[PDB]
């Protein structure tokens, strides 16, 4: 035993515990999903009201990688935002060599990565964040999810947190249901709904609902924040639903 | 317990021992009050001597004209991250004619704690911060965990016995905020919250220290018997 | 017990951590398998999607390093894309500077040395994947060349990787015991992935669908993947003899 | 050849009274034979009732208010709020000019 | 100004029948003025002989420098270094130096210990190798001694007539440039036998 | 981090001794012996080969006596690798003493040097030491035939006869018996040899497990000669002085 | 073995805990700051008497209106206390001023925590820096190895400190001359000291706006020891 | 990141034992069998080609290596290790000689490189030693042919005939009775063909051995004709049909 | 690099590595420094385990640094090559830059400051060696002596020794040395150094080296007959 005390060793098993350990903290984090919809994606996050004094919308846990990705994360947000510096730095070198805005796919191996390099030694320590994001590009939708250990894949939907069995649950469903495919705007009430959902797993605090969207139509393959009268509909439609 | 001898390393159930043992140093340390109406934000302190041959070591720390924080746990910590954020300031000043942004301000502080936490050599800052400004958006006040977590908020308060306070500000959230155009007023609310974590020792006059910003006020600490007026 | 967490020697002369990197290698659970024909060289490679939340188009364990090499690997993704991407980058670098395109056995090599260095040096660790590349050579025609993590490398006629390994090799074994050739006599490349199918459904005792199986195909100036359509195609060939 | 350094024109002058000191300086602005602004500003308060101009080129007279104005700042900030004394600040000054002894600031200053 | 003709200097190496030649003038001066009349400008490192010519502080330090590396050479081969090996070393060591060289015009002499077959070379100032076998000059009398050497030398000659050949054509290129003379030295090189001659010139 | 792993090479114990000085002293005792002595007209220089082969080959083999300089060599008493790092570092050192003052380098300066890199590697670096310990034998014109001796500590001592290497408490004894001050070479030879046979862990003394050296004034008149045995040279020596 | 950085789980830095342990095995220092000066006075513990007592040096001048006494490691002082010189003639050089004592101090105290894996460990010793500027007047000080440096009216470090601060907590007030706090130094330096106090084995100095910093002869501190025993006797 | 093992990782024991070097020379042991023998007009190094799986090619796998034109270099013990010591040797044998003298640096010479290279692995910051023993076969014009061995420590010694690896014990033994200092080349490779043959278990043959020779100098091999002197490398790997022809007079 | 923290506290305050620096010197041999009223004198035991040694190029004990400073050592022999080729090169430094030579007090400040420094850098060791410093500044007839350790203290003495037994030739030294009225002469000066040796060295014979060192850089060593002499004298008078 032993080999749990130091990162980027192999247990006999062939197993990195350290990068397992890291996922715990994700795990311990609050509920962030992400939809894939037919000419974009959708990201909505659970925020955690810890007290009245927090101010609300305040608080912002999106965050935006040049104009057209948008990244969510759950567990240790310094971690995250960490990684999003990260990103927007390999995004901006990107775009000033090859002039076009960094692909979706590019730029998640760029974060995996990088990532992946911190399970390389035992003088840093793995990132304790699982990490959704994506964006539209030029071949259009792309939804990722990230994790500790720099795996990566495509999804269609995506859950991290603790919440992240009962929403995964509710994206199978909405994958089932829809074959020929999810519009923006119903996209955003489901990711209302889906959070609204989760929320049972951290259910003694109150939260705030924080949703954002990219789409080919909606926003021109810009990434920006549900705001206003779109996200008190989503609020009224999440709502209704549990009720 | 085998997981908590450098930074670096994770424990079984995902929690890093030396960030939380550094956490652990701001509770150990003299108890601070933050809270901000629409017009005004202010900081109240309560300082802490070594003995009656001693000072009352600072609390408050000016980093612009529109900005400053308090401090609990290690001052030495807090001089280096309030040196950093003056020069940050400073920097947006000189370049882009720009005063900083409280928000961002709080990003960037939240950065810099952050590698601290997950490379090998070095250690967590072992002191919380909390920040209060006006700027093109109007007051602000955020709370900094050396963590790297940073929360903006209308009251809080850090330090020993720092919940009593902390209720207190819950229960006055409606009244406060409102208190718009009115500094001393604003004081006295921020003055009778620290009380709710005082024990045997009361408020004298080098005791207390005091700060606030505001629309038509630069960042100015109060000190000595400039605040006599609020015991 | 430091001489099992670093890559120093144990007093048997053993280095545990590249020996426990050869156990992360079967961590996905999937079985690999390289064949050659004349004119080509074809890789198959099981792919299980578990979750339906994936998109199974982004699901890969096979990537094409330069136009003419392709890669597929057995082990972790992070590890795996680590190589892919360092593969990639030492091809484009050898050809600007030698002014040809790098061989498949050449790079093999490169990465096999990148290997050693790690099971040497004490602050790298070893990748826990294996590295099969394949390619039509220029000079030495089809070729497989295999990678893993004690920096170990050669040159191949056919082979397996994965946890089913050994049965998938002694099957392949007994065709060119039978054959007395090292290679698949076929004219065309799409019969030569139907012999790679065949015999590895052969091997493990499974059948596959469309969406099972993952195939890669080098032929001349040219590596690619197929496509769930150009696999099924293929499967009903089978089937249909 | 580029070359770094220009001329634009501007005159000041500083007398001292009893209790009392004045720093004038025009406002015209120029490059060669035309005239830039009618009216830019080259006499500057910098704190702790300190007035400075720096005259000649105009984009190193700005850059040495602006550090000095800076180095005000940092005084404050490093020595408890005090106040900068005049033959403090012409101390300090002479500091920032000599920083750039091999690549000067081609101005005249008076504080 | 000219660093190759500030000191002034001449060297010229034969070949002979199973044995070399080479010679020296003894002039060291600054422009005009003459300083020494005992600047020799051959030196040996074991059997292989090097002169050179050129400016007299790379002189100096050239050989200080291939007295270094032969004695190194020597204590990790077990051998002394032949000729053939040393004017790849010499090349080597001015070659390092392409863009801020020693002004020097080397020429290496000496016989093959082994296959007993007479050697001479002679480089520019950055290493280029010039393998003659007839002879090889090098100075500020370059020119001189082409001439002489061209008109005079005969191959296979031996030792005592090989003497007075690199003699004459020494003595009368010196004689006809100003910043060389002042006294001349002669090897006469043989398989295991060296003999060295101060020659009588005159001395303005 | 990586500190888990490290094993602190330069600490002292709570003794105030260098750990692993002393571990790399006990390393060079299981080291073929080798000695040194100095004489008024010369100094010898005999080694024992560790347990050889027949298949060996001798003539062009080299594990004990070598060359630093025409004037200076040395006797080696741990790993061989090891000493050939050093070895070379030294050689470079008399060239570049022999270039810059155009004289050949006193014998105490190289030694000096040769033990401050020692030394080094005791106090600084996290390194391992040199296992390594040299006997040199010298000659220059102010201090005349020397020996010195350095170990892994980069400590040195002057000696007029001396040995290193295995059961040297027994081979100190026997030079510390029969050494005198007006000794000869020739005397030394026999002495060195008698030492080795009598101290020897082998059942006997032949010439395949020896090297041997000496640093001479015989040579033609005011000079110095070094003379590296040969295989033979040394089978006829050990029947002049009536060992074999 | 473990980081030297690194936090115990009480949230303190274990090297600069275990300092202050090698700061309570030093000689004592006294320090008392009054509106006519601040006093400096230190306890020299020779270990033999062979040892030339006055070449022992724990009181020193930092400049003309800063003085300084240590203890602990006093070795670890050297280095702060060319610092510390080198900033205020510094400050003299960009600013044609004297610099304040607590600039000073604070430009000290910006060394302590400078250690990792920079020097390898804190500094093991405490020091008293005393002065007086224009601002603030006469100030005493007390700078550790943490970092922190409090104000202090008095002051005692090292081996008998909680016991002569004990002491200094009764006898201070705010009109003390300075007379009176150069006998109250050796007051209770006689105290808490093993060996009897005298000339050789204590040594005293002050701070004054007029005269500067001055380090007392051992035939003026001598006179103040006579008239200190003839006080106690007298009633 | 930062390598921050600056620190040896092989280290005295009490005894005064070197155990990361103690333990690389077991991981030696455990290696296949390979060995050398010098004749009067050549040099033989030879072992067997463990193939780890019959789909493998074997002749893509070269455990006989060039370092020069006329210097060979075989090994026992963790191939990975070789084939970059290969790289290095082949390399310094240019950078450090040839690059210089304009020359091939002799058989004892570039072997010193060789051990230099090993010894640093050995006292050198975060790394283990060389898991492999070197045997270096070579010829040069002032010390004739030469057979080298190398181990993990940077040691090295010339050798008539040695064995190195899994019956190295075994072998060296049957190699004392058959050596003599009148062998000729075809003798010595007789002679390494019966004494390999005693540590093989399965398969004998051109395909499962690799054998190679210093000798004669080989003109057809120089790829070019025009200078004299240049007459070719002295180093050649035998094929398998010249191996299986000398099995039928074994 | 390496940057490994060797010298740390520990939870009682101590340095150990300090600490044992100064075991390194408590088994060294003795050295002793006692200065006269116009002299200084340096005494030093070889230990007699060492024979066949050759004494005219074995490393002497005490050392110049200058032609009118020199440095005695005990503890780890290695160690003390690199302060004393420090010490040197500080000393042509100084007299280089202010056209002084150096005062015995200022090198003894350097050289502290050399051992203090190795106690708080990273991936270094302290010096196992303390050291007696001794001479006359120029244009000065006031005998120094000054004595450094590990930890980088320094301080002057009347006279003092260290190494192994200093315990015992300290206190004899203490009772015979009287500083109202120290050794007048050179003869006292090193009679005194001697008997102190004696008290601790065995033989008397080639165990014991004395350098005397006087004013306007006159240093001189003394041979072997001129100190058994004092050796002869010392134990004469002992008889009764
Ligand atoms: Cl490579
Ligand atoms: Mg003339």
Same mark, same amino acid.
């Given at each position: ?243 | ?62 980093? %612009? ?34 005063? #900083? ?7 960037? #502080? ?24 006006? %700027? ?49 007023? #604003? ?28 629309? %038509? ?15 | ?241 | ?111 | ?13 034969? =070949? ?36 050179? =010519? ?85 100075? =500020? ?64 | ?244 | ?235 | !990141? ?115 290279? !090993? ?132 | ?240």
């Amino acid at each position: 035993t032993g080999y749990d005390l130091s990162n980027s060793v192999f247990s006999p098993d062939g197993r990195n515990f350290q990068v397992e350990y890291a996922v715990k903290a994700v795990e311990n984090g609050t509920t962030s999903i992400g939809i894939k919809c037919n000419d974009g994606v959708v990201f909505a996050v659970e925020k955690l009201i810890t007290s009245k004094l927090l101010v609300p919308q305040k608080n912002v846990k999106i965050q935006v990688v040049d104009r057209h990705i948008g990244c969510v994360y759950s567990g240790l947000i310094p971690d995250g935002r960490h990684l999003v510096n990260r990103g927007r730095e390999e995004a901006a070198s990107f775009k000033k060599l090859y002039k076009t805005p960094i692909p979706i796919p590019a730029f998640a191996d760029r974060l995996g990565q990088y990532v992946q390099a911190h399970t390389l030694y035992n003088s840093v320590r793995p990132f304790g964040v699982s990490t959704i994001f994506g964006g539209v590009d030029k071949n259009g939708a792309h939804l990722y999810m990230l994790e500790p250990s720099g795996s990566y894949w495509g999804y269609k939907g995506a859950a991290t947190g603790k919440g992240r069995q009962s929403a995964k649950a509710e994206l199978e469903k909405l994958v089932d249901h829809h074959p020929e495919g999810l519009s923006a705007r119903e996209a955003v009430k489901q990711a209302a709904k889906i959070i609204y959902l989760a929320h049972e797993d951290n259910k003694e605090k109150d939260f705030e609902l924080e949703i954002s969207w990219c789409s080919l139509s909606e926003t021109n393959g810009l990434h920006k924040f549900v705001k206003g009268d779109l996200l008190q509909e989503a609020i009224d439609f999440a709502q209704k639903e549990i009720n | 317990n085998n997981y908590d001898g450098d930074t670096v390393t994770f424990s079984p159930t995902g929690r890093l021992f030396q960030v939380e043992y550094a956490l652990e140093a701001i509770k150990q340390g003299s108890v601070t009050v933050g809270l901000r109406s629409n017009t005004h934000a202010v900081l109240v302190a309560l300082k802490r001597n070594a003995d009656e041959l001693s000072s009352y070591q600072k609390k408050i720390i000016k980093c %612009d004209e529109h900005m400053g924080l308090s401090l609990a746990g290690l001052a030495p910590d807090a001089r280096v991250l309030s040196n950093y954020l003056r020069q940050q300031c400073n920097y947006s000043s000189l370049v882009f004619n720009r005063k #900083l942004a409280v928000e961002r301000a709080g990003h960037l #502080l939240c950065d810099k704690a952050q590698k601290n936490t997950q490379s090998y050599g070095g250690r967590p800052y072992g002191v919380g911060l909390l920040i209060i400004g006006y %700027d093109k958006s109007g007051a602000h006040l955020l709370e900094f965990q050396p963590s790297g977590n940073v929360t903006e908020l209308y009251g809080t308060a850090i330090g020993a016995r720092s919940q009593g306070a902390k209720t207190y500000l819950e229960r006055t959230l409606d009244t406060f905020i409102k208190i718009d155009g009115n500094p001393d007023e #604003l004081i006295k609310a921020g003055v009778e919250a620290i009380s709710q974590s005082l024990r045997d020792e009361s408020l004298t006059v080098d005791n207390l220290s005091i700060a606030i910003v505001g629309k %038509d006020t630069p960042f100015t600490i109060y000190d000595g018997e400039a605040v006599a007026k609020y015991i | 017990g430091y001489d099992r967490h670093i890559t120093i020697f144990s007093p048997e002369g053993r280095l545990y951590q590249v020996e426990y990197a050869f156990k992360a290698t079967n961590q996905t659970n999937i079985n690999s398998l390289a064949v050659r024909g004349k004119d080509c060289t074809v890789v198959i490679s099981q792919k299980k999607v578990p979750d339906k939340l994936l998109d199974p188009t982004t699901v890969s364990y096979i990537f094409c390093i330069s136009r003419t090499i392709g890669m597929v690997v057995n082990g972790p993704i992070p590890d795996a894309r680590n190589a892919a991407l360092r593969a990639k980058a030492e091809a484009a670098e050898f050809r600007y500077k030698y002014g040809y395109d790098m061989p498949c056995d050449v790079l093999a090599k490169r990465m096999a040395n990148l290997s050693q260095i790690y099971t040497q040096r004490a602050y790298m660790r070893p990748l826990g994947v294996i590295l099969t590349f394949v390619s039509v050579d220029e000079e030495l025609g089809p070729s497989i060349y295999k990678t893993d993590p004690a920096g170990y490398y050669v040159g191949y006629k056919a082979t397996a990787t994965g946890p089913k390994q050994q049965e998938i090799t002694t099957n392949l074994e007994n065709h060119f015991k039978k054959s007395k050739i090292d290679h698949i006599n076929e004219e065309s490349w799409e019969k030569v992935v139907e012999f790679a199918i065949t015999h590895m459904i052969d091997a493990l005792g499974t059948e596959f669908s469309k969406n099972d199986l993952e195939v890669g195909v080098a032929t001349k100036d040219k590596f690619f993947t197929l496509s769930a359509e150009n696999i099924e195609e293929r499967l009903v060939a089978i089937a249909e003899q | 050849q580029f070359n770094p350094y220009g001329d634009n024109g501007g005159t000041i002058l500083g007398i001292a009274g009893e209790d009392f000191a004045v720093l004038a300086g025009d406002t015209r602005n120029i490059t060669d034979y035309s005239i830039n602004s009618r009216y830019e500003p080259k006499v500057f308060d910098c704190g702790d009732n300190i007035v400075m101009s720096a005259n000649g080129f105009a984009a190193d007279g700005d850059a040495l208010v602006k550090r000095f104005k800076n180095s005000v700042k940092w005084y404050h900030f490093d020595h408890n709020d005090k106040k900068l004394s005049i033959n403090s600040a012409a101390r300090n000054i002479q500091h920032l000019l000599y920083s750039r002894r091999f690549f000067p600031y081609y101005v005249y200053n008076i504080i | 100004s000219d660093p190759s003709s500030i000191n002034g200097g001449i060297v010229v190496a034969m =070949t002979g029948k199973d044995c070399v030649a080479i010679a020296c003038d003894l002039r060291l001066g600054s422009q005009s003025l003459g300083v020494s009349n005992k600047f020799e400008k051959i030196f040996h490192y074991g059997h292989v002989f090097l002169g050179i =010519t050129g400016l007299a502080t790379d002189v100096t330090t050239l050989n200080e420098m291939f007295r270094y590396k032969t004695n190194l050479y020597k204590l990790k081969e077990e051998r002394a270094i032949e000729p053939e090996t040393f004017t790849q070393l010499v090349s080597s060591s001015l070659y390092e130096r392409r863009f801020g060289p020693y002004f020097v015009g080397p020429v290496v002499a000496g016989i093959n210990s082994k296959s007993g077959k007479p050697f001479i070379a002679g480089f520019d100032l950055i290493g280029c190798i010039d393998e003659a076998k007839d002879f090889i000059v090098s100075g =500020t009398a370059s020119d001189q001694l082409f001439g002489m050497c061209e008109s005079l030398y005969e191959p296979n000659l031996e030792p005592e007539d090989l003497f007075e050949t690199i003699s004459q054509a020494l003595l009368n290129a010196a004689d006809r440039d100003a910043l060389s003379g002042w006294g001349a030295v002669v090897y006469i090189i043989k398989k295991d036998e060296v003999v060295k001659r101060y020659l009588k010139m005159r001395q303005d | 981090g990586s500190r888990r792993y490290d094993s602190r090479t330069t600490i002292f114990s709570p003794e105030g001794r260098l750990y692993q000085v002393e571990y790399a002293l006990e390393s060079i005792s299981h080291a073929g012996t080798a000695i040194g002595i100095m004489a008024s007209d010369g100094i010898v220089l005999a080694a024992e080969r560790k347990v050889t082969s027949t298949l060996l080959e001798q003539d062009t083999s080299t594990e004990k006596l070598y060359k630093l300089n025409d004037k200076i060599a040395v006797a080696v008493a741990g790993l061989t690798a090891d000493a050939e790092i050093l070895i070379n570092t030294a050689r470079i050192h008399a060239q570049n003493y022999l270039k810059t003052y155009n004289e050949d380098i006193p014998v105490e300066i190289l030694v000096r040097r040769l033990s401050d890199i020692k030394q080094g590697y005791t106090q600084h670096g996290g390194l391992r030491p040199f296992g390594v310990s040299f006997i040199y034998a010298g000659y220059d014109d102010r201090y005349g035939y020397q020996l010195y001796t350095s170990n892994p500590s980069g400590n040195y001592t002057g000696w007029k006869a001396i040995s290193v290497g295995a059961n040297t408490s027994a081979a100190q004894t026997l030079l510390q018996m029969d050494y005198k001050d007006d000794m000869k070479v020739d005397d030394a030879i026999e002495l060195a040899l008698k030492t080795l046979s009598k101290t020897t862990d082998s059942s006997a003394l032949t010439y395949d497990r020896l090297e041997f050296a000496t640093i001479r004034k015989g040579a033609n008149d005011g000079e110095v000669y070094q003379k590296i045995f040969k295989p033979q040279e040394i089978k006829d020596i050990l029947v002049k002085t009536g060992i074999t | 073995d473990r980081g030297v950085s690194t936090f115990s789980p009480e949230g303190r830095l274990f090297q600069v805990e275990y300092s202050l342990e090698a700061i309570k095995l030093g000689s004592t220092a006294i320090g008392i700051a009054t509106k006519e000066g601040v006093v400096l006075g230190v306890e020299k513990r020779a270990t033999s008497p062979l040892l030339e007592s006055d070449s022992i040096e724990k009181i020193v001048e930092i400049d003309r209106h800063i003085g300084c006494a240590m203890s602990g490691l006093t070795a670890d002082a050297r280095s702060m206390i060319e610092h510390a010189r080198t900033a205020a003639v510094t400050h003299n050089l960009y600013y044609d001023e004297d610099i304040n004592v607590e600039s000073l101090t604070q430009s000290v105290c910006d060394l302590a925590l400078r250690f990792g894996e920079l020097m390898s460990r804190p500094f093991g010793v405490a020091l008293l820096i005393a002065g007086h500027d224009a601002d603030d007047g006469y100030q005493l000080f007390h700078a550790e190895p943490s970092g922190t440096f409090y104000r202090y009216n008095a002051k005692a470090i090292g081996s008998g400190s909680e016991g002569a601060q004990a002491e200094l907590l009764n006898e201070w007030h705010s009109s003390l001359t300075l007379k009176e706090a150069e006998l109250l130094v050796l007051k209770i330096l006689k105290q808490v000291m093993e060996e009897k106090l005298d000339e050789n084995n204590a040594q005293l100095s002050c701070i004054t706006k007029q005269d500067g910093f001055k380090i007392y002869d051992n035939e003026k501190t001598a006179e103040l020891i006579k008239e200190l025993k003839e006080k106690e006797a007298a009633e | !990141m930062t390598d921050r093992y600056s620190f040896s990782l092989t280290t005295f024991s009490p005894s005064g034992k070197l155990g990361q070097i103690d333990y690389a020379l077991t991981a030696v042991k455990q290696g296949v069998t390979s060995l050398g023998i010098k004749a009067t007009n050549g040099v033989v190094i030879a072992t067997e080609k463990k193939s780890s799986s019959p789909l493998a090619m074997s002749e893509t796998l070269s455990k006989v290596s060039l370092l020069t034109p006329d210097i060979g270099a075989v090994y026992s013990g963790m191939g990975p290790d070789y084939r970059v010591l290969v790289d290095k040797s082949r390399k310094v044998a240019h950078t450090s000689y040839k690059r210089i003298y304009g020359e091939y640096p002799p058989t004892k010479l570039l072997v010193s490189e060789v051990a230099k290279i !090993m010894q640093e692995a050995t006292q050198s910051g975060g790394v283990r030693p060389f898991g492999v023993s070197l045997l270096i076969a070579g010829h040069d014009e002032f010390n004739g042919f030469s057979l080298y061995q190398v181990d993990p420590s940077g040691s090295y010694f010339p050798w008539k005939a040695t064995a190195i690896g899994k019956g190295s014990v075994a072998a060296k033994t049957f190699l004392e009775k058959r050596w003599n200092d009148e062998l000729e080349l075809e003798d010595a490779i007789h002679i390494a063909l019966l004494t390999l043959k005693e540590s093989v278990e399965g398969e004998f043959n051109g395909d499962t051995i690799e054998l190679a020779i210093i000798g004669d100098e080989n003109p057809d091999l120089l790829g070019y004709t025009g200078i004299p002197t240049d007459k070719g490398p002295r180093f050649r790997k035998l094929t398998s049909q010249e191996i299986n022809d000398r099995l039928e007079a074994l | 690099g390496y940057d490994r923290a060797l010298s740390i506290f520990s939870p009682d305050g101590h340095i150990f590595q300090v600490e044992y620096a100064l075991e390194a010197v408590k088994r060294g041999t003795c050295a002793v420094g006692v200065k006269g009223k116009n002299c200084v004198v340096l005494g030093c035991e070889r230990r007699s385990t060492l024979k066949l040694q050759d004494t005219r190029i074995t490393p002497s004990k005490v050392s110049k640094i200058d032609s009118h400073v020199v440095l005695s050592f005990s503890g780890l022999n290695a160690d003390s090559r690199i302060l004393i080729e420090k010490a040197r090169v500080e000393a042509q430094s100084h007299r280089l830059t202010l056209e002084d030579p150096v005062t015995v007090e200022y090198l003894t400040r350097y050289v502290a400051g050399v051992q203090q420094r190795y106690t708080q850098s990273g991936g270094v060791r302290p010096f196992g060696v303390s050291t007696l410093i001794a001479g006359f500044d120029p244009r000065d007839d006031e005998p120094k002596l000054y004595q450094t350790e590990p930890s980088g203290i320094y301080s002057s003495w009347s006279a003092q020794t260290i190494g192994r037994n200093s315990k015992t030739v300290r206190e004899f030294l203490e009772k015979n040395y009287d500083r109202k009225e120290p050794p007048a002469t050179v003869e006292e000066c090193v009679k005194l150094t001697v008997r102190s040796l004696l008290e601790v060295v065995q033989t008397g014979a080639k165990n014991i080296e004395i350098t005397v060192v006087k004013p306007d850089s006159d240093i001189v060593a003394l041979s072997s007959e001129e100190i058994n002499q004092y050796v002869t004298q010392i134990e004469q008078e002992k008889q009764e």
